[PDB]
Amino acid sequence: TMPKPQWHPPWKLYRVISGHLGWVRCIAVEPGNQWFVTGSADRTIKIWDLASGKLKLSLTGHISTVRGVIVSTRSPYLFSCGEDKQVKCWDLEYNKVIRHYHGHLSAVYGLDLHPTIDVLVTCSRDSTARIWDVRTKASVHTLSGHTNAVATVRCQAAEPQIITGSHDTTIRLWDLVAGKTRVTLTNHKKSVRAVVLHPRHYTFASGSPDNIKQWKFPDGSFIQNLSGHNAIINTLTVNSDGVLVSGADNGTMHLWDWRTGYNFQRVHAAVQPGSLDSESGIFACAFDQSESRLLTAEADKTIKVYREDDTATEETHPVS
Amino acid sequence: DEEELNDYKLRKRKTFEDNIRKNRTVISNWIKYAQWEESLKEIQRARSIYERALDVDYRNITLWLKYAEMEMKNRQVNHARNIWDRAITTLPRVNQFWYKYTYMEEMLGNVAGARQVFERWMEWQPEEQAWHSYINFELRYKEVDRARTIYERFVLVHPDVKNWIKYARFEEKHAYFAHARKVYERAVEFFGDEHMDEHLYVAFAKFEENQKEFERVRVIYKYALDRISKQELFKNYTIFEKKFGDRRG
Amino acid sequence: VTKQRVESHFDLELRAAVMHDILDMMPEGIKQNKARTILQHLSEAWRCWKAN
Amino acid sequence: WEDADFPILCQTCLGENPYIRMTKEKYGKECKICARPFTVFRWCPGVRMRFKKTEVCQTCSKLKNVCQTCLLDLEYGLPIQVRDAGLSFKDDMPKSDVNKEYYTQNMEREISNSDGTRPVGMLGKATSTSDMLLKLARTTPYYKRNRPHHEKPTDPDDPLADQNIKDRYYGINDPVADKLLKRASTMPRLDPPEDKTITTLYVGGLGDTITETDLRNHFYQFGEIRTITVVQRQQCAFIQFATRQAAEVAAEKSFNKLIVNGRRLNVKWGR
Amino acid sequence: PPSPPAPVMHSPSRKMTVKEQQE
RNA sequence: GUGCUCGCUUCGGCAGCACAUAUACUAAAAUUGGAACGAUACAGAGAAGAUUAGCAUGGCCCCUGCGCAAGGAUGACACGCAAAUUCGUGAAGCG
RNA sequence: CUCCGAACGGUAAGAGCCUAGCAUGUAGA
């Protein structure tokens, strides 16, 4: 029912970090694969060297969980956002807050910086999202309409520029400038938390308890229903070679190929020493810039780092 | 009457309105108001109620059904058609809606519009039971070509050998043994060596038995078991017993 | 958020996070799993952790 | 954001000049009814005329389709009281502040989801014409209105001077409509007979061009007719109709309008 | 009054057995 | 009103042409109707108040204040809504 | 020796009765 799926070598766990004192809610990578940022519910924000796996820095911004961060590739800025109703921006030469965009009403849940228009787009459990001027603390649009907490946003240059998925189980595509709803999709049954945009196929996938779904831009054409990783899914991350990663809620991490939707690996990770298994979980993922290694921030205060498997061949690992 | 019933009307109107006022929730009070005013046969008032509750919650199928049935009872055919098309436009998966709607098409008698609604419906590829309600409709009139075209699209939208076997049985029942032999041949062609299984080839042996071609029955049975997956134990045994039946009978 | 409402706030955020997560995943108690009762059991589990 | 790129006004509020220069100021003022910021149009209704503006939300202009700068029915030129009372339309636009503003914004959402040419709601559903509305209608352009409000100023004892815009729109206490409604109540109409058994229609002035053929041809629309007796002696035609409801409909219909071959023949009760 | 509700392009439910109905 | 016609053709009149393109809540407003912690006078901390907690939800609102300061002062009968058998009914499907 | 402070964190309690500076500038006949 499909052309024979390609062969991607599996992934093996090799390096494990344990430095936080709470859940690790979000994690991002620096433009040049030298260091990655972590934001936790311990309220810290910790910068780590990507090579030596050593904690380069820690900074005590928030008042509660840091629910999401993002590093600027057009500046030495780093934007944090947390359930303290507030969003902050750090200069990373002087390591300090430089402006704070007030305005939301409840816990921010996630955010993204638009690659070319210098704005932020942040989603919040207050049933909205907003578009922020970078510098001047100006919000141009309250992208509104989701009947509940806008569980995530991703933004991109092309039309449409803003996709937001929610606990209303809907997905919504917005025109940025008029700040208006353009299109809705409502295929899902259970809330939808993870949306990811392909780098070179003008497409995007959304995850929910039921299973992943795939769509074609700019319209919202359903494509290809991906099933198999039946667990509350928390982040989707896609790689250069079409490797697509779904981190589930309960630790079970699943891999597939983007083209055929071929679930070709299940990794089922082991918790730290002191953590009961029931505290297992995955909360965010990110491939490095060079896309060789993979970071995953788990729900037991640890950051696990997987590497492409080098000893893999078609016979070591056949495709079926 | 004149004023003593007007009193009754003001009272109970305000009672219903106050109840749904305090609540804004469950359409129990809504629907009871709908029936209060359909028993008063103030159809426009009860329809306004219906639309207000539609705005309250547009997602109640029994609410839409109350609407449609009231329209059928008070003969407002065009408005019932309006309601019907609105629903099925809004909830393509509530097959209660398509079912009762094409039922309405049959009641009004417009088999043409019945066909059209069934057509818009099959676009959602609803389900085997939907295609089969479609085919029972199409066979309340002869329409044999339409029948087999329904079957042909159906067994491809739900490409199940069992659906194909229902197609084959319909072919036999309507005496198209030519097209039915072609049904089974094309069916094994499509299902291919990869995944095909017992029931199809036992069915082909049995059809050819009824055609009294025992030699071809046996070439079918053995050549198929050799070409495809064979074995496991209960399958081999039942197939061998059906082959014994094909030989003897 | 200010040191007064830190506790009440974080509590609100926690209870609601619980509601979202499970009582959108665990159902198939679809009507309402008596979430309110599952949250009563939450509170009781806490109490008992506090009292060993 | 209430935004009109067109004005909703009859020729009466428009002005006599076929070439009108009109400026628009978006959100220049809130709706006096809706409190909604809408585009106000400023244009000179003439040389030596008042340079007027459009002041209502397109909600308010659309729902009751009153010429926004005339507040007059764009089809009837008539005040809201006369218009609604002639179409028997008791328009219960709520009086409260919350209901007024919210319902005006709601009829505005309904206007934007409607074609914007035909009114959204119940009054736009009673397009059943009124003969008394035709009688009250002024089909001439009241350009002298377009002048500003050097003459003896409006007398305070005449109940028209103090102009009540809000109630005169929302359906209460229109003085000019009250006066014209007294006029259209005292206007000539066919009073029904106390003697119930005669379906006896007299036609006075029927003339030499109308024969019994064309007379019954006009009489056909209202119901069965038993007998016809024309007198060229009195230029009259006495028709006995078969039905009482028929004769009543024929009376109200042909009273003061029926022109058979150009001339109005007096439809009167028989004697 | 917001924009009209888009059709709920949805799946059908598969009802609750006694097994998970008590589970 | 400017300027021109080898304009009628005088310098008086008429025409033709080139332009020069539409002010302005135009009203002397016609009208329309209110409140002070003011004066006096009185009077005198009038206990009745322990009303035995605070923070929320929350859009419950107004005031000072330039305030994403700061600070005032306020609403609790915030409930009964019923997962759930039992039969009956109709609809569909199979024989 | 010539370095100059500002506010808030406050003036009551009421009774009966008295008087006021304002405001707007209204389509249809």
Side-chain angles (χ1 to χ4, degrees), chain A residues 3-278 280-320, chain B residues 1-21 23-77 79-128 130-197 199-230 245 249, chain C residues 1-24 27-30 34-52, chain D residues 4 7 15 18 28 35 37 45-46 77 79 85-86 94 116 119 121 124 126 137 141 148 153 156 159 161 171 175 177 184 188 192-193 204-205 207 223 237 242 246-247 250-251 262 270, chain E:
Chain A
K4 181 185 191 61
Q6 196 185 355
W7 181 84
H8 310 286
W11 288 84
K12 66 184 187 58
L13 199 187
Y14 93 97
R15 158 196 288 220
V16 162
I17 297 206
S18 9
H20 273 269
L21 313 188
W23 287 341
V24 199
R25 295 309 282 269
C26 122
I27 150 200
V29 208
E30 171 273 352
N33 249 12
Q34 295 328 287
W35 44 266
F36 60 79
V37 155
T38 49
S40 123
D42 144 64
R43 308 180 295 162
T44 39
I45 270 182
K46 300 171 176 324
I47 239 194
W48 313 73
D49 164 27
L50 181 36
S52 79
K54 299 179 171 291
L55 182 63
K56 288 173 49 92
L57 199 37
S58 154
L59 15 147
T60 83
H62 278 257
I63 308 207
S64 152
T65 305
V66 154
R67 182 77 74 115
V69 312
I70 170 61
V71 57
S72 165
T73 176
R74 298 181 274 162
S75 159
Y77 284 144
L78 176 82
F79 297 74
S80 126
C81 62
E83 309 157 354
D84 35 16
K85 319 211 278 173
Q86 46 186 284
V87 201
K88 306 203 140 296
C89 170
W90 295 67
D91 170 293
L92 324 160
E93 288 163 12
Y94 335 119
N95 318 328
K96 189 167 290 286
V97 155
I98 43 197
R99 81 201 29 75
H100 103 247
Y101 309 65
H102 195 285
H104 274 281
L105 266 41
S106 317
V108 164
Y109 271 58
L111 88 178
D112 194 319
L113 214 178
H114 188 283
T116 41
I117 351 155
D118 301 67
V119 295
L120 273 196
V121 179
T122 90
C123 56
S124 99
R125 179 159 78 60
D126 105 84
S127 74
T128 118
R130 284 172 185 258
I131 298 204
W132 308 87
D133 158 289
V134 163
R135 327 219 305 293
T136 78
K137 188 180 330 174
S139 86
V140 317
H141 276 286
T142 128
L143 314 187
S144 87
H146 278 284
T147 54
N148 202 323
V150 187
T152 170
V153 14
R154 294 222 167 291
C155 65
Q156 62 143 24
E159 191 102 352
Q161 295 141 303
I162 275 190
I163 320 183
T164 88
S166 140
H167 290 33
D168 61 21
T169 73
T170 79
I171 306 201
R172 260 125 175 269
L173 310 88
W174 312 58
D175 158 84
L176 181 132
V177 44
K180 294 326 253 164
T181 318
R182 297 169 49 264
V183 199
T184 280
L185 316 153
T186 157
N187 327 41
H188 285 294
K189 276 175 282 193
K190 317 209 111 346
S191 102
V192 177
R193 328 200 162 155
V195 299
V196 60
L197 325 173
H198 214 272
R200 51 211 220 219
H201 293 20
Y202 193 55
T203 38
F204 66 98
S206 97
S208 173
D210 310 11
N211 57 341
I212 298 79
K213 306 252 182 32
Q214 231 156 9
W215 330 77
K216 160 163 60 194
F217 261 173
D219 29 39
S221 155
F222 166 73
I223 302 186
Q224 169 179 9
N225 170 302
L226 264 40
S227 300
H229 189 190
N230 312 259
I232 330 164
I233 299 200
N234 267 334
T235 53
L236 295 139
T237 287
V238 71
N239 197 60
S240 208
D241 327 18
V243 244
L244 181 67
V245 188
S246 63
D249 148 271
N250 48 35
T252 14
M253 160 185 221
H254 281 39
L255 295 205
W256 357 49
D257 157 63
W258 173 261
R259 201 284 283 273
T260 114
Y262 171 55
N263 159 53
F264 70 110
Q265 218 178 339
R266 308 172 157 181
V267 181
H268 182 161
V271 290
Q272 260 201 296
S275 72
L276 347 138
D277 77 336
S278 187
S280 33
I282 268 242
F283 270 66
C285 332
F287 276 93
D288 56 316
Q289 308 287 356
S290 314
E291 298 185 86
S292 43
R293 279 193 291 201
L294 163 61
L295 310 201
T296 82
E298 266 202 26
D300 63 355
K301 330 220 176 178
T302 46
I303 294 209
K304 314 183 158 55
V305 169
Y306 290 27
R307 183 214 324 176
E308 248 174 327
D309 219 352
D310 38 10
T311 85
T313 88
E314 281 56 20
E315 68 81 18
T316 332
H317 313 90
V319 176
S320 177
Chain B
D1 194 3
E2 324 98 343
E3 217 285 326
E4 303 285 80
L5 176 273
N6 183 87
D7 274 26
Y8 178 45
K9 275 194 172 201
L10 268 182
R11 296 190 278 257
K12 280 280 316 169
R13 265 175 203 141
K14 301 195 34 173
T15 71
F16 280 110
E17 286 312 321
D18 283 349
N19 304 330
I20 298 124
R21 183 267 314 296
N23 298 266
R24 287 328 171 187
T25 192
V26 55
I27 40 189
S28 75
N29 303 0
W30 266 125
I31 271 164
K32 300 220 80 187
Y33 195 17
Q35 282 335 285
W36 190 91
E37 214 137 16
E38 181 192 342
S39 156
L40 269 175
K41 269 193 166 185
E42 280 136 336
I43 51 133
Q44 207 34 81
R45 277 175 150 281
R47 285 151 144 206
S48 70
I49 292 147
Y50 266 110
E51 303 293 18
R52 294 159 33 152
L54 188 145
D55 327 314
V56 183
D57 161 32
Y58 76 85
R59 286 196 218 194
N60 185 295
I61 50 136
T62 52
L63 217 48
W64 282 81
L65 287 213
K66 275 311 201 63
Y67 204 9
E69 283 300 347
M70 193 266 298
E71 298 297 311
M72 270 179 272
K73 297 168 79 235
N74 290 323
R75 317 163 79 65
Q76 275 86 29
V77 187
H79 313 86
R81 296 193 242 228
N82 305 329
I83 298 166
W84 276 126
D85 60 59
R86 309 180 144 106
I88 56 202
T89 322
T90 358
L91 309 118
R93 309 314 229 281
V94 190
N95 288 348
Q96 273 55 39
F97 280 163
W98 302 96
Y99 268 179
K100 289 211 163 193
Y101 185 30
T102 41
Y103 208 107
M104 190 145 183
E105 268 310 277
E106 212 132 29
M107 306 190 262
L108 326 162
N110 186 16
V111 177
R115 269 150 209 156
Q116 190 45 84
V117 180
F118 262 103
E119 283 295 323
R120 319 140 83 194
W121 191 16
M122 280 318 107
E123 322 197 57
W124 314 103
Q125 313 105 298
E127 50 249 67
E128 262 90 349
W131 295 94
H132 288 346
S133 317
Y134 191 19
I135 199 54
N136 301 332
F137 165 77
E138 264 309 295
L139 266 298
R140 289 141 228 190
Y141 318 84
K142 189 60 205 102
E143 282 289 340
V144 210
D145 67 305
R146 190 56 51 63
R148 44 169 34 115
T149 311
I150 290 190
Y151 254 112
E152 269 289 342
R153 290 260 53 66
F154 150 70
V155 310
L156 280 186
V157 181
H158 317 333
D160 295 30
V161 72
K162 170 211 75 163
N163 291 2
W164 287 69
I165 292 195
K166 301 314 312 192
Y167 183 20
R169 191 50 148 190
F170 144 91
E171 287 295 315
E172 292 195 357
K173 252 187 238 208
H174 284 280
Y176 308 102
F177 291 166
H179 313 81
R181 147 179 285 101
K182 305 188 205 184
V183 153
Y184 277 162
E185 303 286 345
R186 291 152 53 174
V188 314
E189 151 232 330
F190 137 70
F191 244 92
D193 303 78
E194 178 205 33
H195 267 99
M196 216 180 308
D197 258 9
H199 270 272
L200 171 49
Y201 275 120
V202 193
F204 216 160
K206 293 306 289 188
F207 144 82
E208 279 279 346
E209 148 184 348
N210 284 282
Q211 312 296 311
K212 275 191 263 140
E213 286 289 351
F214 176 45
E215 57 279 26
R216 220 153 306 271
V217 164
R218 274 321 276 177
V219 77
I220 284 158
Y221 183 107
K222 280 327 299 170
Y223 158 83
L225 271 292
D226 186 10
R227 182 193 220 169
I228 72 188
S229 85
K230 71 172 302 174
Chain C
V1 156
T2 44
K3 207 274 203 192
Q4 33 125 188
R5 282 191 274 184
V6 166
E7 276 80 327
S8 288
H9 185 82
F10 155 97
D11 187 83
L12 213 38
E13 306 305 331
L14 187 56
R15 165 180 307 267
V18 147
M19 187 90 75
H20 290 353
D21 271 348
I22 265 288
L23 310 153
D24 282 27
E28 269 70 319
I30 272 152
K34 283 103 92 182
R36 195 217 295 156
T37 216
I38 220 217
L39 288 207
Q40 273 216 15
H41 273 332
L42 193 43
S43 153
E44 173 64 24
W46 173 241
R47 257 197 175 72
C48 289
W49 190 93
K50 256 160 49 162
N52 198 32
Chain E
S3 89
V8 294
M9 269 70 68
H10 226 180
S11 284
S13 8
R14 319 151 323 289
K15 208 41 59 198
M16 56 202 73
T17 93
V18 228
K19 182 164 33 183
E20 53 92 344
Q21 173 147 43
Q22 49 83 13
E23 278 215 350

